[PDB]
RNA sequence: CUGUUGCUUAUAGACGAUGGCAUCAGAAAUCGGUGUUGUAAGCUUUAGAGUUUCUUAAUCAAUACUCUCGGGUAUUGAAUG
RNA sequence: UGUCGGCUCUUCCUAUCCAUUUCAAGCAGAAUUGAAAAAAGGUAUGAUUGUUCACCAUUUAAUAGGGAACGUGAGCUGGGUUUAGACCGUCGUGAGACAGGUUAGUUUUACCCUACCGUUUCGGUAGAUUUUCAAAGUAUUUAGAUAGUAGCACAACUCAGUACGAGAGGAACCGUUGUGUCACGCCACUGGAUUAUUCAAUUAUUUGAUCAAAUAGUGUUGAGAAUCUAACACGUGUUGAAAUAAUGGCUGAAAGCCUCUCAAGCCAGAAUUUCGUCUAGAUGAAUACUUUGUCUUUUUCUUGUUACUUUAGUACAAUUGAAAAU
RNA sequence: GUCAUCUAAUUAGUGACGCGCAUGAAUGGAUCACCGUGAUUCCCACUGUCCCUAUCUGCAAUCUAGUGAAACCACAGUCAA
RNA sequence: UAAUAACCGCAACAGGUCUCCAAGAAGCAAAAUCUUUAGUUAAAUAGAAUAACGCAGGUAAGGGAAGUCGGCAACAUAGCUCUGUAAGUUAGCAAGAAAGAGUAGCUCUGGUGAUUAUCGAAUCAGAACUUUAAAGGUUAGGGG
């Protein structure tokens, strides 16, 4: 469901790295389990950047979402990453929105900004964003 | 048994053994394949690395997603003052490789070239190239020179010019010049020598060797790091904290029965002063004549390439220079042997025109803000000093 | 660009940008200015600031 | 001619090695350039909440503006003269 | 001969899991299935158990199987087993027994030879005499017998909702653009360390007070240049030619026809081999200056080499040695 | 073992079932509130334990002047078959 | 002498060996840290260079036990005042449960007594103003 070629973003989220939930689906935190498209290596934990589809389990939220494995996309991260035009930026906290494999966003709103790298990757997310940093 | 989980081996076997070099300059071990259907041309140079700085480059490529504003890229400033050709040498292909047939030398030899033949100049009688110079015009020693040329035109296949730098134009403390044999690639051997003889004693500038937007194969000697362990040298995994007799080492240096440590096992040693040749190093700006400054069409302030306070540990760049792309092997003041590429690149990046929107000349110490010292004084105003 | 706390003119490709959760983003010039901004330090009381130097004199 | 020795030698370095210079040497300060910190020490702004007094003034007073983009530091592995 | 497993690291086998090249299908497409060349590259993250094994949750192109004294303990760990304490269950009249269970239980030395990684010091290659030459010394520029080898893989746009197919579904070659990892670097930008005990502040004690410091083995905090470094910043390895393997073929006999050849002669075809390029490298070559012009041996001067010195002795220009190919 | 629960995933933990190879009543059976440098499991905070290693200080290590042992030792020490 | 050199340990061995006298700052404290009278600067040798691998002491981006047999090791809470404090229970305890607020500097005010206005004690409370917003140099509970 992604539309385009992601650039290099310094991944700052590991395995078992709790992120918030910018969605409005009644889920609070989703601890990352894996990362889709991760070419692994020995003794290396899966890394999630910005705009990287992950697979995360909800450990806090509504009962129909708790204790289940979902698929999310990281919209903002606290790890500084450098754009190609020489801009060095980082956000205030990590967050991720629940999507499906086709990219269809499960919620209907996003709280806070959205990183540009995760907006053009999934056109279904950029529409819901308040702003796109 | 078999290792439980397979991994990529650490370090490269194409560089073993890792023996540090002796001479600071890195001899170029191969020159581009000779093409016999073009005007003879030099295929190399020799410049002293000065440092690095960052530029904002306008993208001139097609079907790319890079921002239209600019892309921030690192460059390297290699100061190359003009070299002086001091002879030439003709090689011949035998059943044991090239065999230098003869070598013709110019008449007037600078004192920076004579020093290379001695190990203690202050006590040396400094009589190098004296008998050769004093008898240069004699008829007996003029027929010998004319004989050497006819030998090369008949029994030689490769002609190279023994060119040496000028050490009075660089801020280095060294005085003796660095000697390089730059091959001539072009027409038949009849016109190679006629080109080589025409170059004697005549300075050659970098723009007569390289061109704009040309990729080159820099050859140099890396940084010196001395004795280093196994973690730094090869990159093995550091052992757990509980380990007895230390952590940062390889644990098992071989299985039992071969009864010998393999040559492939990661061992301690001397990482450091090695020789490496990189390839496909794009040239951004050719600091010859008009482009010797750091101004551009977009930013038109007249500033030299030397940052505020000079290049650290190096000094001030005032002569001809290059703008390589990215990091070239070797610390500042190293002698870098540029060379025309042996395998020319055909990628769409290598054929792309380089348009520079900005070149950083701010200071390289601390988090400097201003670009030229004539604009720091304007923004900060008058100090207590000078007032 | 102009630094949020120090009020100095940022060069190109220098500085780090901080994006808050309330959609507002600031660009700084060094970690000295970013750190003093994250502690609610008032630039009007910090002498070297360009904001302070504009207020007086 | 090479080696030792010297610059408490660097572009190298465990020791050897390697690289530079050796009287146009080399070193040391000083003056600039370039950086780091944040306004030095002395007295003044009845700034200053109050107390004490002469008996209707001074004293003491966290902090605080002027001189102050001040002082201090800056090759030690930074660059000029 | 320190007797399980795991962590770390290297190499080897192919009975191949992925990537490359080909044949067969009950191969229309997509998916899959059987086999051939091929070991140069890669083959994961976790919950429970001491576990090898096992079973699950994911991810990837694939998460293939094995050997090296069941690789690897003066490499580690000591979870189990496998001493001495203690408890339970069964057995035994009793001491006690139990591949039954639970808990606590010291892991010694390398400074030796070799191996491997690096690093020095002394020695050295035999046939050359157009003085425009030849040889030795010192130094520079080169040369490269041999040894190693490095780049792989994925994804997106276009191809294209096209070929195929009734429909459902549904690819590919050239081209463009990025990512991951491995290797080699590198210090501009961004980040980290920081006894420049740099600058500033401050807690306790002591210099009568201010200034200036000192002590708490670096008192602590904030900023912090230099240098080091990034799995955290960023560059290079898109790089060319020839010949091959499985297989597909051309001309073509044997065998008047047929056949790619267990025939002569050729072409196309691999992540293959060899040149090219990269790193280390021995015998060498040219030039510069000092000499020597037949000759060595022994003593002897130097940090060491060459030239040099003395007394000797030895021959003195003149008939040798090439056809190639079949 | 089976069934619930814990986790994305549970030979582990807890709660129930009991033809219990071989539990069971001063060889004491059931029950634990407080207490324990006792045994086991899961949460919150915290962190170089780990992803993934980077850097700093003292003492050493290296070289040097003086002093200066011990374990061990058939003879010794390059490989393939 | 009565011990990091006179005793016992093969010795000028970091081990062991019964007692008396006891200053200031600071605190609740004979705690940690600094000083006065007293003792000593030598107690198995030093200089240079600032490599690896070490012993001892540290710090760190983003994530926070994914490492491992196991949170081993390390990090984090910590003094005092006020508010509040569950299930269970042998009715005593659990309990410092858990959880939250305050704390500096300077200038002031009031309360707590003896003798008939003077004199003496550290202790508690409250109010302005300022700053770098305050137990944390040292000592100093992780909780369920």
TrEMBL record, chain A:
Q: Which PROSITE patterns match?
A: RIBOSOMAL_L14
Q: Name one GO molecular function term.
A: structural constituent of ribosome
Which Gene Ontology BP terms does the record give? Answer: translation
Kindly give the Gene3D superfamilies that the UniProt entry links to this protein: Ribosomal protein L14 (2.40.150.20)
Q: Alphabetically list the UniProt keywords.
A: Ribonucleoprotein, Ribosomal protein
Q: Name one GO cellular component term.
A: cytosolic large ribosomal subunit
One Pfam family this sequence matches? Ribosomal_L14
Q: Which CDD domains match?
A: Ribosomal_uL14
| UniProt xrefs under NCBIfam families | PRK08571.1 (NF006344)
Family, per the entry? Belongs to the universal ribosomal protein uL14 family.
- What HAMAP family does the record point to? Ribosomal_uL14 (MF_01367)
Checking PANTHER family in the record gives: 50S/60S RIBOSOMAL PROTEIN L14/L23 (PTHR11761), LARGE RIBOSOMAL SUBUNIT PROTEIN UL14 (PTHR11761:SF8)
UniProt-recorded name of the protein: 60S ribosomal protein L23, putative
State the organism of origin.
Entamoeba histolytica (strain ATCC 30459 / HM-1:IMSS / ABRM)
List the top taxonomic levels of the source.
Eukaryota, Amoebozoa, Evosea, Archamoebae, Mastigamoebida
TrEMBL record, chain B:
Please provide, alphabetically and separated by semicolons, the GO molecular function terms listed in this UniProt record: RNA binding; structural constituent of ribosome
Any one GO biological process: translation
Its cellular-component GO annotations read: cytosolic large ribosomal subunit
Transmembrane feature ranges:
none
Keywords of this entry: Ribonucleoprotein, Ribosomal protein
- Keyword Ribonucleoprotein carried by entry: yes
Superkingdom of the organism of origin: Eukaryota
User: Does Ribonucleoprotein show up as a keyword for this record?
Assistant: yes
Under the heading Gene3D superfamilies, the entry gives: 3.30.1430.10, Ribosomal protein L3, domain 3 (4.10.960.10), Translation factors (2.40.30.10)
Which family does the similarity line name?
Belongs to the universal ribosomal protein uL3 family.
Name listed for the protein in its UniProt record: 60S ribosomal protein L3, putative
TrEMBL record, chain C:
GO function term, MF aspect, one: structural constituent of ribosome
- GO CC annotations? cytosolic large ribosomal subunit
Where would I find the Large ribosomal subunit protein eL24-related N-terminal domain in this sequence? 1-57
Example GO BP: cytoplasmic translation
The alphabetical list of record keywords is: Ribonucleoprotein, Ribosomal protein
Q: Report the sequence similarity comment from the record.
A: Belongs to the eukaryotic ribosomal protein eL24 family.
Official protein name in the record: 60S ribosomal protein L24, putative
Source organism of this protein record: Entamoeba histolytica (strain ATCC 30459 / HM-1:IMSS / ABRM)
Range within the parent protein? 6 to 62 of 163
């Amino acid at each position: 469901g992604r539309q385009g070629n992601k650039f290099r973003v310094t991944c700052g989220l590991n395995n078992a790295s709790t992120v918030n939930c910018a969605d409005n689906t009644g889920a609070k935190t989703l601890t990352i389990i894996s990362v889709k498209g991760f070419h692994g290596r020995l003794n290396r934990l899966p890394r999630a950047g910005c705009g990287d589809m992950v697979v995360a389990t909800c450990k806090k939220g509504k009962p129909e979402y708790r204790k289940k494995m979902h698929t999310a996309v990281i919209i903002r991260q606290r790890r500084t990453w450098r754009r190609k035009d020489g801009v060095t930026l980082y956000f205030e906290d990590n967050a991720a929105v629940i999507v499906n494999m086709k990219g269809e966003m499960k919620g209907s709103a996003i709280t806070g900004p959205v990183s540009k790298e995760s907006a053009d990757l999934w056109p279904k997310i950029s529409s819901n964003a308040p702003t796109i940093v | 048994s078999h290792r439980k989980f397979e991994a990529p081996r650490h370090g490269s076997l194409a560089f073993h053994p890792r023996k540090r070099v002796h001479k600071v300059r890195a001899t170029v071990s191969a020159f581009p394949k000779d093409n016999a259907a073009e005007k003879p041309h030099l295929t190399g140079f020799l410049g002293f690395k000065a440092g690095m700085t960052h530029v904002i480059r306008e993208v001139k490529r097609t079907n790319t997603k890079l921002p239209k504003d600019g892309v921030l890229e690192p460059v390297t400033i290699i100061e190359t003052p003009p070299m002086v050709v001091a002879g030439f040498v003709g090689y011949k292909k035998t059943t044991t490789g090239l065999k230098p047939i003869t070598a013709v030398f110019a008449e007037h030899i600078a004192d920076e070239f004579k020093r290379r033949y001695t190990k203690k100049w202050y006590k040396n009688t400094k009589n190098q190239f004296a008998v050769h110079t004093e008898k240069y015009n004699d008829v007996k020693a003029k027929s010998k020179r004319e004989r050497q040329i006819r030998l090369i035109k008949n029994r030689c296949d490769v002609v190279r010019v023994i060119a040496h730098t000028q050490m009075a134009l660089v801020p280095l403390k060294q005085k003796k010049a660095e000697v390089m044999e730059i091959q001539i690639n072009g027409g038949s051997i009849a016109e190679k020598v006629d080109f080589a003889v025409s170059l004697l004693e005549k300075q050659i500038s970098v723009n007569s060797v390289f061109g704009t937007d040309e990729c080159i194969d820099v050859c140099s000697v890396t940084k010196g790091h001395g004795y280093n362990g196994v973690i730094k040298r090869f990159g093995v995994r550091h052992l757990p904290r509980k380990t007895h007799r230390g952590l940062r080492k390889v644990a098992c240096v071989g299985a039992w029965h071969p009864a010998r440590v393999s040559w492939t096992v990661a061992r301690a040693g001397q990482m450091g002063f090695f020789k490496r040749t990189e390839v496909n190093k794009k040239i951004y700006r050719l600091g010859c004549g008009d482009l010797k400054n750091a101004k551009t069409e977009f930013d038109i302030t007249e500033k030299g390439i030397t940052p505020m306070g000079g290049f650290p540990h190096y000094g001030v760049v005032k002569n001809d220079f290059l703008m390589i792309k990215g990091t070239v092997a070797g610390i500042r003041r190293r002698v870098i042997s540029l060379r025309k590429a042996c395998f020319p690149s055909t990628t769409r990046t290598a054929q792309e025109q380089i348009v520079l929107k900005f070149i950083d000349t701010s200071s390289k110490y601390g988090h400097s803000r201003f670009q030229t010292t004539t604009e720091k004084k304007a923004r900060m105003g008058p100090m207590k000093k000078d007032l | 660009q102009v630094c949020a706390f120090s009020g100095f003119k940022i060069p190109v490709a220098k500085g780090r940008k901080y994006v808050r959760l309330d959609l507002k983003s600031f660009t700084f010039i060094n970690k000295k200015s970013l750190m003093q901004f994250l502690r609610k330090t008032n630039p009007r009381k910090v002498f070297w600031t360009a904001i302070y130097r504009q207020l007086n004199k």
